[PDB]
Write an enzyme that holds these catalytic residues in place. Structure first.
Site, PDB file in Angstrom:
ATOM      1  N   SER A  30       0.843  -1.190   0.000  1.00  0.00           N
ATOM      2  CA  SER A  30       0.000   0.000   0.000  1.00  0.00           C
ATOM      3  C   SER A  30       0.886   1.252   0.000  1.00  0.00           C
ATOM      4  O   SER A  30       2.046   1.200   0.401  1.00  0.00           O
ATOM      5  CB  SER A  30      -0.893   0.046   1.241  1.00  0.00           C
ATOM      6  OG  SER A  30      -0.140   0.223   2.434  1.00  0.00           O
ATOM      7  N   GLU A  80      10.845  -6.318 -21.028  1.00  0.00           N
ATOM      8  CA  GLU A  80       9.924  -5.952 -22.099  1.00  0.00           C
ATOM      9  C   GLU A  80       8.759  -5.072 -21.621  1.00  0.00           C
ATOM     10  O   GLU A  80       8.265  -4.250 -22.396  1.00  0.00           O
ATOM     11  CB  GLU A  80       9.444  -7.208 -22.843  1.00  0.00           C
ATOM     12  CG  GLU A  80       8.883  -6.872 -24.212  1.00  0.00           C
ATOM     13  CD  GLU A  80       8.269  -8.023 -24.961  1.00  0.00           C
ATOM     14  OE1 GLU A  80       8.771  -9.162 -24.818  1.00  0.00           O
ATOM     15  OE2 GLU A  80       7.256  -7.792 -25.662  1.00  0.00           O
TER      16      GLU A  80
HETATM   17  N1  LIG Z   1      -7.160  -3.151  -1.681  1.00  0.00           N
HETATM   18  C1  LIG Z   1      -6.722  -3.294  -0.422  1.00  0.00           C
HETATM   19  N2  LIG Z   1      -6.364  -2.217   0.279  1.00  0.00           N
HETATM   20  C2  LIG Z   1      -6.019  -2.512   1.547  1.00  0.00           C
HETATM   21  C3  LIG Z   1      -6.027  -3.741   2.165  1.00  0.00           C
HETATM   22  N3  LIG Z   1      -5.579  -3.630   3.469  1.00  0.00           N
HETATM   23  C4  LIG Z   1      -5.306  -2.352   3.615  1.00  0.00           C
HETATM   24  N4  LIG Z   1      -5.548  -1.621   2.485  1.00  0.00           N
HETATM   25  C5  LIG Z   1      -5.240  -0.198   2.283  1.00  0.00           C
HETATM   26  O1  LIG Z   1      -3.905   0.021   2.710  1.00  0.00           O
HETATM   27  C6  LIG Z   1      -3.812   1.276   3.428  1.00  0.00           C
HETATM   28  C7  LIG Z   1      -3.348   1.040   4.845  1.00  0.00           C
HETATM   29  O2  LIG Z   1      -2.102   0.316   4.782  1.00  0.00           O
HETATM   30  P1  LIG Z   1      -1.908  -1.180   5.317  1.00  0.00           P
HETATM   31  O3  LIG Z   1      -1.339  -2.019   4.244  1.00  0.00           O
HETATM   32  O4  LIG Z   1      -3.100  -1.673   6.047  1.00  0.00           O
HETATM   33  O5  LIG Z   1      -0.726  -0.872   6.350  1.00  0.00           O
HETATM   34  P2  LIG Z   1       0.658  -1.623   6.616  1.00  0.00           P
HETATM   35  O6  LIG Z   1       1.505  -1.672   5.405  1.00  0.00           O
HETATM   36  O7  LIG Z   1       0.349  -2.901   7.291  1.00  0.00           O
HETATM   37  O8  LIG Z   1       1.316  -0.602   7.652  1.00  0.00           O
HETATM   38  P3  LIG Z   1       1.152  -0.329   9.254  1.00  0.00           P
HETATM   39  O9  LIG Z   1      -0.057  -1.125   9.692  1.00  0.00           O
HETATM   40  O10 LIG Z   1       0.948   1.169   9.335  1.00  0.00           O
HETATM   41  O11 LIG Z   1       2.435  -0.790   9.909  1.00  0.00           O
HETATM   42  C8  LIG Z   1      -5.188   1.934   3.310  1.00  0.00           C
HETATM   43  O12 LIG Z   1      -5.251   2.833   2.204  1.00  0.00           O
HETATM   44  C9  LIG Z   1      -6.118   0.732   3.123  1.00  0.00           C
HETATM   45  O13 LIG Z   1      -7.347   1.087   2.494  1.00  0.00           O
HETATM   46  C10 LIG Z   1      -6.388  -4.887   1.395  1.00  0.00           C
HETATM   47  O14 LIG Z   1      -6.370  -6.059   1.762  1.00  0.00           O
HETATM   48  N5  LIG Z   1      -6.725  -4.559   0.096  1.00  0.00           N
END
Ligand SMILES: Nc1nc2c(ncn2[C@@H]2O[C@H](COP(=O)(O)OP(=O)(O)OP(=O)(O)O)[C@@H](O)[C@H]2O)c(=O)[nH]1
Ligand SMILES: Nc1nc2c(ncn2[C@@H]2O[C@H](COP(=O)(O)OP(=O)(O)O)[C@@H](O)[C@H]2O)c(=O)[nH]1
Ligand SMILES: COc1ccc(/N=N/c2cc(OC)c(OC)c(OC)c2)cc1O
Ligand SMILES: [Ca+2]
Ligand SMILES: [Mg+2]
Lengths: 437, 155, 426
Positions: free
Chosen positions: A140, A254
């Site tokens: 993310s 590519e």
């Molecule tokens: N599409 C999608 N977005 C997700 C998912 N889980 C979290 N998000 C998005 O990811 C962002 C939050 O980051 P996360 O990936 O949950 O955080 P992390 O990388 O675990 O980081 P920390 O918890 O802060 O240590 C937000 O914008 C969420 O909407 C998922 O399974 N799918």
């Protein structure tokens, strides 16, 4: 063949990775325990699927993948789920304390405690490769680990693997399913420090996917399970050329040659069609012309923007299923003369086409209906600068008052790094304007 | 110098000592460095019996210290209802103004001594008296959202 | 991020701390003997956050009880869940503080602080992943206020990387007409601005106002005020105690709710308001943002919300809550800062609190909280100008400059809220 290692960082990267590897297993005919009855070469091989799966002496097919998170909750679901026997257990790495939605904790203070273990475990997979081409990195923009730890990992992979390609699948934040108010800061900071180290990055806008689930799949309140299932279907269409025989995007290099004319403007737009609800099991099958036309409708895009307000620099069409090459040529001919599709004057005005004649796979439990033909268009358009402008504006509103900045400065980060990252985004917006936004 | 001992006895609440010192010629209107008299100190520390005995031996009910504080200002500030009534019975100026523009009403209102506020209003406290910042006791009630205090002042 | 170490200091601190343990044990299915007699696995998932597991399936609160007056330990023990606390964790002095902040912070309180720190070390070493500390105390007294803040500063030195959170009870003359309370509150707020990451402001003025005007109780008692305090504490700790979509912890709350380090004083709210012994989703959203439901005596329509966290409890549609929350933000758009996008977070939890089938708790970081600080400051200035009872503080080692510095710091904090209240994006 040449190997690819996938790295899944943080909650979003890990949850999307689990959905992707489940779909890859069903497309290749790999069981949850790793057995592949169609594979006659036990213990090894030079086949197309071996780019993503290694083989043990006992016929087990193991993903070339690493999952890393700073807290254990999400990776523990992978360790106890259906595909718990598929992955190498040492390639599921977890810390104890997360980055608290803070880029600086992911990059400098907490992330520093596990970076060396992650690189040693990545090295163990790289040693098993005869011709590693590069890395696919899932994360993310908004999370502290997804933003901070990914930029530290990408910085280190550029030193230890100088000539290997690095591709990203990045989750761009949406207000509807966001976690933190500081997500614009984390997104701008990771974009700044990863820009030099990534060759090509496919942004997935959570608002674009949320809207597709509501409109096409009639899901009233989509959850991450619904979003991730649709995202994995699109990621699969993008990586299919690396896992199967074909003539377009056959290696990581590519992707760069066909979609990235200059190193900084390395953000292609993905459009996908058709997306049909599973409750319509007897839907009319759409023609090659109807699904190709749907690729130029902003509603089917992975990033919310308007390609009519921009110019194209590259366009690749990737079909799957019952598609006759003659019908593709005829549909493209209509697209060139009828519609207002403008290319830059320095690029050849043309479409690159790839066809895999196997229809897309549907996962049991999914929201998508089976279709006889599908298409994923990958284009590099200057209209994607609208996504950067929306994000830069949210950053500017908070940064003008220095809101939340103390949380970052307190975790080993200098205040100047925010202005340096923001100027780099100002220069990126000008790079799209210079080409033609 | 018995005036210095009478000041300490009035503050400490030593009734018998106050009676002895007055009998030996102690100055009932003695002042400390800041102009406080035994009556100011007895009214501040809640010694009602000392206040009554000092008022029957020539204490100036309207003495002011160096900041314009009268014994009624301090009794209204600290919240000694019985002392407030005794001071008013002996001619305390209900509308006396200190160096900050405050009257006993302003101090009873700020500290939330609602029973003392009712007493002061009944003894003619001026609802239009403004402090150095232009505020009346009613402005203090509206500015700090004290609906109980505002109802009493609107009577 | 899992374990929280709870400290309760002084009379108010121990009284509201005991009610907190009574209300949360019942929600998790824990009886006064520490045995789990519940009927849901969702109660035991994050139980380690507040409870230490002991042999024979026992759950002991990770609570430390402190006070200089010894009579408080007896009143806590005689309570329903009085024997569940670890006997080693009771650390009580011989002579009280007598509502004097200097006795708590510099003389009586300073002689017992090392004994409390040894008990804090014992609980912190037995923690796998310590989040931080939670302290319950009043600011108008002597022990919770003076010794409570000294404890905060010393715990901050040994654990600078953990979160310090307080539930601070603000004084009001409507509940205690003790005139030294503005001094003890001002001297404590000066310490809380510097040494805590998050503080919930629980105002006795608002609690009395709710009881007397809304619940129609003509003579409110501490039990009636504490009924509202326990409901608020249960509501604001819901996502620390139950799984939910977010993996909420004390650091994620601070990073997302605190944009400026000094503006960490929250205005909690609760809906519906109910008396001890004795609602649709749009009514709960409406009641959450109403001045009558705020636990701090401030009108939120006199200021602007920098950040808001709302938690809904019970069986309800998650789509209806999303629509109703966006609806409140449109009709009341001028009461939210436009320079912090997406500054309202919502969460839902399946398990509602005792008696109430529906519930809604509000946590706001609003500039209107300056009204609470202005009220205390005016009372402090009225007393300090006349130097009333100052000798009670200077005789215990304090110097006059400490009062002027505390007043100056609190007035600077009010000016800082006003600055962001008038700030624009353009
Ligand atoms: N599409 C999608 N977005 C997700 C998912 N889980 C979290 N998000 C998005 O990811 C962002 C939050 O980051 P996360 O990936 O949950 O955080 P992390 O990388 O675990 O980081 P920390 O918890 O802060 O240590 C937000 O914008 C969420 O909407 C998922 O399974 N799918
Ligand atoms: N809400 C509430 N306020 C209380 C309670 N007990 C005392 N207070 C308030 O706490 C302040 C006095 O502090 P207290 O806790 O008694 O003294 P300490 O033991 O020296 O900390 C006053 O403002 C009281 O009104 C209680 O149980 N509930
Ligand atoms: C506007 O930005 C935001 C503000 C606050 C955020 N969440 N904070 C929490 C934390 C909680 O428990 C510690 C909650 O339980 C009481 C809780 O209930 C709703 C929310 C997250 C944000 O993205
Ligand atoms: Ca093989
Ligand atoms: Mg995470």
């Amino acid at each position: 063949m040449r190997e690819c290692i996938s790295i899944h960082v943080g909650q979003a990267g890990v949850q999307i990775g689990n959905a992707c590897w489940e779909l890859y297993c069903l497309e290749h005919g790999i069981q949850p325990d790793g057995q592949m009855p169609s594979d006659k070469t036990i213990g090894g091989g030079d086949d197309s699927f071996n780019t993503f799966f290694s083989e043990t002496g006992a016929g087990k097919h193991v993903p070339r993948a690493v999952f890393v998170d700073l807290e254990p909750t999400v990776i523990d679901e992978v360790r106890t789920g259906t595909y718990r026997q598929l992955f190498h257990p040492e390639q599921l790495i977890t810390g104890k304390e997360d980055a608290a939605n803070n880029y600086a904790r992911g990059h400098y203070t907490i992330g520093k405690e596990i970076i060396d273990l992650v690189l040693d475990r990545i090295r163990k997979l790289a040693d098993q490769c005869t011709g590693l081409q590069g890395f696919l990195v899932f994360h993310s923009f908004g999370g502290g680990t997804g933003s901070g730890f990914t930029s530290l990992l990408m910085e280190r992979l550029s030193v230890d693997y100088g000539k290997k390609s690095k591709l990203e699948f990045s989750i761009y934040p949406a207000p509807q399913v966001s976690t933190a108010v500081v997500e614009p800061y984390n997104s701008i900071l990771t974009t700044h420090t990863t820009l030099e180290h990534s060759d090509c990055a496919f942004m997935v806008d959570n608002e674009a996917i949320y809207d597709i689930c509501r409109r096409n799949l009639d899901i009233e309140r989509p959850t991450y399970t619904n979003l991730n299932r649709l995202i994995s279907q699109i990621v699969s269409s993008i990586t299919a050329s690396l896992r199967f025989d074909g003539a377009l995007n056959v290696d990581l290099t590519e992707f760069q040659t066909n979609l990235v004319p200059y190193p900084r403007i390395h953000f292609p737009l993905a459009t996908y069609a058709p997306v049909i609800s599973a409750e319509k099991a007897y839907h009319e099958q759409l023609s090659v012309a109807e699904i190709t036309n749907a690729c130029f409708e902003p509603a089917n895009q992975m990033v919310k923007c308007d390609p009519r307000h921009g110019k194209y620099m590259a366009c690749c069409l990737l079909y799957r299923g019952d598609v006759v090459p003659k019908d593709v040529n005829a549909a493209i001919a209509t697209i060139k003369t009828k519609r207002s599709i403008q290319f830059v004057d320095w690029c050849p005005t043309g479409f690159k086409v790839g066809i895999n004649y196997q229809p897309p796979t549907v996962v049991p439990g999914g929201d998508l209906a089976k279709v006889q033909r599908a298409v994923c268009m990958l284009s590099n358009t200057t209209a994607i600068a609208e996504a950067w402008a929306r994000l830069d504006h949210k950053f500017d509103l908070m940064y003008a008052k220095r809101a939340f900045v103390h949380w970052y400065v307190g975790e080993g980060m200098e205040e100047g790094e925010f202005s340096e990252a923001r100027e780099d985004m100002a220069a990126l917006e000008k790079d799209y304007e210079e080409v033609g936004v | 110098d018995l005036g210095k001992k009478l000041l300490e006895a009035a503050r400490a609440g030593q009734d018998d000592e106050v009676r002895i010192l007055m009998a030996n010629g102690a100055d009932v209107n003695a002042t400390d460095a800041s102009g406080l008299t035994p009556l100011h100190l007895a009214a501040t520390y809640g010694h009602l019996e000392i206040v009554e005995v000092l008022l029957k031996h020539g204490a100036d009910v309207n003495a002011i210290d160096i900041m314009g504080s009268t014994p009624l200002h301090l009794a209204a500030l600290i919240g000694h209802l019985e002392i407030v009534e005794v001071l008013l019975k002996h001619g305390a100026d209900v509308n006396a103004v200190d160096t900050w523009g405050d009257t006993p009403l302003h101090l009873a209102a700020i500290m939330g001594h609602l029973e003392i506020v009712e007493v002061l209003l009944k003894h003619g406290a001026d609802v239009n008296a403004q402090d150095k910042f232009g505020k009346t006791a009613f402005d203090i009630s509206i500015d700090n959202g004290n609906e109980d205090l505002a109802e009493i002042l609107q009577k | 991020m899992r374990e929280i170490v709870h400290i309760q200091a002084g009379q108010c601190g121990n009284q509201i701390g005991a009610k907190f343990w009574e209300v949360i044990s019942d929600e998790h299915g824990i009886d006064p003997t520490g045995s789990y007699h519940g009927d849901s696995d969702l109660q035991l998932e994050r139980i380690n956050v507040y409870y230490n597991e002991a042999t024979g399936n026992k759950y002991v609160p990770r609570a430390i009880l402190v006070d200089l007056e010894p009579g408080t330990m007896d009143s806590v023990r005689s309570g329903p869940f009085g024997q569940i606390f670890r006997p080693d964790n009771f650390v009580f002095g011989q002579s009280g503080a007598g509502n004097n902040w200097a006795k708590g912070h510099y003389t009586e309180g300073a002689e017992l602080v090392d004994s409390v720190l040894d008990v804090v070390r014992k609980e912190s070493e037995s923690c796998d992943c310590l989040q931080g500390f939670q302290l319950t105390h009043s600011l108008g007294g002597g022990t919770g206020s003076g010794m409570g803040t000294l404890l905060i500063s010393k715990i901050r030195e040994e654990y600078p990387d953990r979160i310090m959170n307080t539930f601070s009870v603000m004084p009001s003359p409507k509940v205690s007409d003790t005139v030294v309370e503005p001094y003890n509150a001002t001297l404590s707020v000066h310490q809380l601005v510097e040494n805590t990451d998050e503080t919930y402001c629980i105002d006795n003025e608002a609690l009395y106002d709710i009881c007397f005007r809304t619940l129609k109780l003509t003579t409110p008692t501490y039990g009636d005020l504490n009924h509202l305090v326990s409901a608020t504490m249960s509501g604001v700790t819901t996502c620390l105690r139950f799984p939910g979509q977010l993996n909420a912890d004390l650091r994620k709350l601070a990073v997302n709710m605190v944009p400026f380090p000094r503006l960490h004083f929250f205005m909690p709210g609760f809906a519906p308001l109910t008396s001890r012994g004795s609602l649709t989703v749009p009514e709960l959203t409406q009641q959450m943002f109403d001045s009558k439901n705020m636990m701090a005596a401030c009108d939120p329509r006199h200021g602007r919300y920098l950040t808001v966290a709302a938690i809904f409890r019970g069986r309800m549609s998650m789509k209806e809550v999303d629509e109703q929350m966006l609806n409140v933000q449109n009709k009341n758009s001028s009461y939210f800062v436009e320079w912090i996008p997406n500054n309202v977070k919502t969460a839902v939890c399946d398990i509602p609190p005792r008696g109430l089938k529906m519930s809604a708790t509000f946590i706001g970081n609003s500039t209107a909280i300056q009204e609470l600080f202005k009220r205390i400051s005016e009372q402090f200035t009225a007393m300090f100008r006349r130097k009333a009872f100052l000798h009670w503080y200077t005789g215990e080692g304090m110097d006059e400059m400490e009062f002027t510095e505390a007043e100056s710091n609190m007035n600077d904090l009010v000016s800082e809220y006003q600055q962001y209240q008038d700030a624009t994006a353009d």
